[PDB]
């Protein structure tokens, strides 16, 4: 019913086989069993071999050995340097052929088996392996925005694979868990952060048996299960008159709820919480702050080892567009930075990559680096809400690396975002990264076949943010489409270029938005320009942009450390790609590229469509080297992309010609 994605395990030719007779499985835990089963599956599919699974080595057999450090006869120095529980070593014996996959814990053996299979899919020579791998981020999580009626909020890839008709739908969940574990993902929240009436009951006896069955499957693949919760649950399901976190009976209700969940799911991860945001209830309803609110839940989960993931996407969703001094981009920092040092140690603040809302380009959220005493994790959006909704191609890995590599200068040079969220800069006990899932029930999982690369690459970056976009794309393409060099170079080029192409024909120079309200797909320059969501570009007949300077604007630049604040504050040094996020400028202002702002708009919108046409041409040149079904699936979306790009180009160019009166330098067609 559905694609294997990158775990194709395509049969090798006769010149690319391996000789093994046994798999030595030193443990029989559910994770070890999963790891053995995956190894058997990949070796049968790729190599046409069926080695016997044994618990003790045969010293004359060719073997793959699976074990932790304490299972080793001799513990050699490389695996001796492992410190992270999920780390592993893979090494070929240099003496029969033996591969040792040595994990610090059972999950390290599982990740090591997926790495060894990845090497095989990629055609690597395994005769002399010596590999050590340890993840950089402790939490590597997926958030689902699935509802129990089967819809998915901002889902562009079909219906929920978890829920239908206000109930739970499992073989597809197992295959999903395999995909997640193959790229190291170790945590999942299964339900929408906007928790509606049925979903509120996921923390009650009526649904916990079902939650536990799903948690059982994920546990076997090293994945902890979380639920998103309704902060007002003590009222809605617990029959209490209030949800105030300082009310003693509320506090007790949450403690009892925690105890009940852990009876069904003894390793339950904890709660994801959207509170006091977009009309979802929270501590503010009772005049409480978010440390009081998060700490109350944290205290309920603490005896059991659970975490509270408290989202920082908090802002005034009833902003007056007339009020130019109120800045939504400042809201998260202003709410949370004063609370540093007030949170319990099992609270993690989860902060989106940018301060507004997953736009095609945003600067980095100032909260990263600003709270040395509070755990932080970053949230990115794998589902392409503002980045083309899986109709347009948009490989998000280059954007995420720009965010991860941004130096906050919080402790001087070398204070990159990735060091904040991996916990090393400030010694966070719990931290990491989360991604909003792009999957659904479509047979290709992600709507656009090539959007499988975004789920893959999310997991790779969460494991090691220092991996290049180039090598992630290479890994993904080879595993998914094979090793023909034209196919690999072409699809890698398509992926690596796609975000810039989509940006070119959507909103200019960092200002964001210019999307249709509601569904958020397609061009509408004034879509939210007189609305109450704080998302304005202030275009008039003379110029455009948000003045976020301290000197004359909202003062948002001051939320950065001095080196970045100065860069953005000055009109002359602010990078072109963010100019209109930080400055209000005339259409005739000249950018670092030499272009005026208005001619930049025309250039990128005309040229963006030409680039989209080239994406499609380059894919067509692969006909015959890709199976027809995926060839045509992708070609259909690239054609949709080209036609919609023309709409983006002409709507934006006409809007700005109608406002600026300045023609295209080159005389190209503006309606």
Ligand X SMILES: O[C@@H]1[C@@H](O)[C@H](O[C@@H]2CO[C@@H](O)[C@H](O)[C@H]2O)OC[C@H]1O
Catalytic residue among 48, 93, 249, 278: 278
The distance of closest approach from Cβ of residue 537 to a copy of itself in the complex, given in angstroms and rounded to an integer, is 11
Q: 239: Cβ–Cβ under 8 A, 6 or more apart, which residues? A: none
Pure H helices in 265-390: 290-301, 331-336
Asked if 464 is part of the footprint of ligand GCW (rule: CB under 6 A), the reply reads no
Catalytic residue among 79, 385, 503, 569: 385
Contacted entry of a copy of itself, ligand X, ligand GCW, none for residue 413, CB cut-off 5 to 8 Å set by kind: none
φ, ψ of residue 60 in degrees (nearest 5):
-105, 5
Asked if 603 is part of the footprint of ligand X (rule: CB under 6 A), the reply reads no
Q: 190: Cβ–Cβ under 8 A, 6 or more apart, which residues? A: 144, 146, 162, 211, 214, 225, 226, 227
Cα distance between residue 257 and residue 255, in whole Å: 5
Contacted entry of a copy of itself, ligand X, ligand GCW, none for residue 533, CB cut-off 5 to 8 Å set by kind: ligand X
Q: 620: Cβ–Cβ under 8 A, 6 or more apart, which residues? A: 635
Residue 522 C-beta-side C-alpha neighbours within 13 Å: 12
Rounded to the nearest 5 degrees, what angle is found at the Cα of 61, between the Cα atoms of 59 and 63? Answer: 100
Binder of ligand GCW out of 71, 72, 149, 153 (CB under 6 A): 153
Residues making contact with a copy of itself (CB under 8 A): 321-322, 517-518, 523-526, 529-530, 539-542, 650-651, 654-655, 657-661, 671
φ, ψ of residue 187 in degrees (nearest 5):
-155, 145
Catalytic residue among 22, 357, 379, 569: 357
Instruction: Return the number of the residue (389 or 479) whose C-beta is nearest ligand GCW.
Output: 389
* Token output for 458: 């999310």
**368 to 397: interface string for ligand GCW, x by CB under 6 A:** -----------------x------------
- The answer to whether residues 330 and 337 touch, using CB atoms and an 8 Å cutoff, is no
User: How much is the CA Rg of the chain, to the nearest whole Å?
Assistant: 26
- Burial state string for 316-338 with b = 16 or more CB within 10 A and e = fewer than 16: eeebebeeeeebbbbbbbebbee
Asked if 154 is part of the footprint of ligand GCW (rule: CB under 6 A), the reply reads yes
Instruction: Return the number of the residue (287 or 518) whose C-beta is nearest ligand X.
Output: 518
Binder of ligand X out of 114, 395, 430, 533 (CB under 6 A): 533
* Token output for 339: 């609370």
The distance of closest approach from Cβ of residue 524 to a copy of itself in the complex, given in angstroms and rounded to an integer, is 7
What's the burial of 36, exposed, middle or buried (CB within 10 Å: 0-12/13-18/19+)?
A: buried
Rounded to the nearest 5 degrees, what angle is found at the Cα of 241, between the Cα atoms of 240 and 246? Answer: 85
Instruction: Return the number of the residue (392 or 600) whose C-beta is nearest ligand GCW.
Output: 392
Contacted entry of a copy of itself, ligand GCW, ligand X, none for residue 471, CB cut-off 5 to 8 Å set by kind: none
The distance of closest approach from Cβ of residue 51 to ligand GCW in the complex, given in angstroms and rounded to an integer, is 46
The distance of closest approach from Cβ of residue 142 to ligand GCW in the complex, given in angstroms and rounded to an integer, is 14
Contacted entry of ligand GCW, a copy of itself, ligand X, none for residue 194, CB cut-off 5 to 8 Å set by kind: ligand GCW
Contacted entry of ligand X, a copy of itself, ligand GCW, none for residue 658, CB cut-off 5 to 8 Å set by kind: a copy of itself
> Is 385 among the catalytic positions?
yes
Binder of ligand X out of 48, 278, 643, 647 (CB under 6 A): 278
Asked if 535 is part of the footprint of ligand X (rule: CB under 6 A), the reply reads yes
Asked if 619 is part of the footprint of ligand X (rule: CB under 6 A), the reply reads no
* Token output for 629: 């079904």
Of 144, 171, 165, nearest to 228 by C-alpha is 144
> Is 73 among the catalytic positions?
no
Of 188, 405, 196, 218, nearest to 309 by C-alpha is 188
The distance of closest approach from Cβ of residue 7 to ligand GCW in the complex, given in angstroms and rounded to an integer, is 29
Cα distance between residue 216 and residue 479, in whole Å: 28
Instruction: Return the number of the residue (199 or 416) whose C-beta is nearest ligand GCW.
Output: 199
* Token output for 607: 């040229």
Asked if 318 is part of the footprint of ligand X (rule: CB under 6 A), the reply reads no
Asked if 518 is part of the footprint of ligand X (rule: CB under 6 A), the reply reads yes
Contacted entry of ligand X, a copy of itself, ligand GCW, none for residue 539, CB cut-off 5 to 8 Å set by kind: a copy of itself
> Is 334 among the catalytic positions?
no
Q: Which residues bind ligand X (CB under 6 A)?
A: 278, 357, 518, 533, 535
Residues forming the active site: 278, 357, 385
Q: Which residues bind ligand GCW (CB under 6 A)?
A: 145, 153-154, 193-194, 274, 313, 357-358, 385
């Amino acid at each position: 019913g559905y694609e294997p994605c990158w775990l194709r395990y395509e049969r090798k030719d006769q010149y690319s086989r391996l000789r093994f007779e046994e798999i030595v499985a030193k443990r029989t835990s559910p994770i070890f069993q999963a790891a053995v089963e995956e190894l058997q599956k990949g070796l049968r599919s790729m190599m046409e071999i069926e080695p016997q699974v044994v618990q003790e080595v045969n010293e004359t057999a060719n073997s793959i050995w699976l074990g932790t450090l304490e299972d080793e006869e001799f513990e050699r120095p490389l695996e001796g340097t492992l410190v992270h529980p999920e780390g592993y070593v893979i090494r070929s014996d240099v003496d029969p052929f033996r591969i040792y996959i040595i994990g610090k814990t059972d999950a390290g053996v599982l990740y090591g088996v997926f790495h060894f299979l990845r090497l095989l899919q990629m055609g690597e020579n395994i005769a002399q392996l010596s590999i050590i791998e340890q993840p950089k981020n402790r939490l590597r999580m997926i958030n689902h925005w699935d509802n129990m009626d089967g819809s998915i909020e901002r889902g562009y890839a079909g219906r929920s694979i978890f829920f239908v008709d206000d109930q739970f739908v499992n073989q597809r969940i197992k295959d999903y868990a395999r995909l997640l574990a193959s790229v190291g993902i170790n945590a999942i929240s299964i339900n929408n952060v906007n928790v509606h009436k049925t979903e509120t009951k996921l923390i009650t006896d009526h649904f916990l048996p079902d939650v536990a069955e799903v948690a059982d499957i994920f546990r076997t693949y090293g994945i902890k299960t979380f639920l998103s919760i309704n902060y007002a649950s003590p009222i809605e399901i617990g029959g209490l008159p209030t949800a105030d976190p300082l009310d003693p009976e509320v506090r007790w209700w949450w403690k009892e709820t925690a105890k009940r969940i852990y009876q069904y799911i003894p390793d339950f991860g904890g709660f994801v919480v959207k509170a006091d945001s977009e009309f979802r209830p929270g501590p503010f309803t009772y005049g409480r702050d978010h440390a009081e609110g998060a700490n109350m839940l944290a205290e309920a989960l603490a005896p059991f080892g659970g975490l509270v993931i408290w989202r920082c996407f908090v802002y005034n969703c009833q902003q007056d567009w007339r009020d130019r001094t109120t800045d939504r981009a400042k809201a998260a920092y202003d709410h949370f930075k004063p609370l540093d040092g007030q949170f319990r140690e099992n609270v993690i603040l989860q902060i989106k990559n940018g301060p507004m809302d997953f736009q095609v380009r945003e600067p980095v959220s100032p909260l990263f680096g600003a709270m040395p005493k509070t755990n932080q994790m970053m949230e990115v959006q794998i589902t392409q809400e503002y980045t083309g909704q899986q109709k347009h191609l948009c490989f998000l890995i280059p954007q995420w690396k720009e965010v991860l590599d941004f130096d906050t200068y919080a402790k001087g040079k070398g204070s990159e975002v990735k060091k904040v969220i991996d916990g090393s800069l400030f010694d966070y006990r719990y931290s990491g990264i989360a991604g909003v899932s792009n999957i659904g029930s479509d047979p290709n999982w992600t709507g656009h076949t090539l959007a499988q690369a975004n789920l893959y690459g999310f997991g790779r970056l969460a494991w090691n943010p220092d991996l290049s976009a180039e090598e992630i794309a290479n890994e993904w393409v080879v595993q998914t489409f094979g090793d023909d060099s034209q196919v690999v170079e072409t699809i890698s080029w398509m992926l690596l270029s796609s975000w810039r192409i989509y940006e070119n024909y959507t909103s200019p120079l960092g200002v964001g938005w210019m999307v249709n309200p509601g569904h958020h797909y397609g061009p509408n320059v004034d879509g939210y320009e007189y609305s109450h969501w704080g998302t304005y570009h202030y275009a008039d007949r003379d110029g455009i942009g948000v003045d976020r300077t301290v000197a004359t604007g909202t003062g948002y630049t001051a939320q950065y450390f001095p080196e970045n604040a100065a860069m953005y504050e000055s009109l002359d040094t602010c990078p072109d790609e963010l100019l209109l996020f930080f400055h209000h400028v005339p259409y005739t202002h000249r950018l670092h590229s030499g272009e005026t702002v208005i001619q930049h708009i025309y250039n990128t919108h005309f040229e963006g469509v030409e680039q989209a046409k080239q994406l499609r041409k380059r894919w067509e040149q692969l006909k015959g080297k890709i199976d027809e079904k995926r060839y045509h699936d992708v070609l259909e979306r690239l054609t949709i992309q080209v036609e919609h790009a023309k709409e983006w180009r002409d709507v934006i160019n006409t809007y700005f010609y109608r406002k600026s009166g300045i023609d295209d330098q080159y005389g190209r067609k503006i309606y």
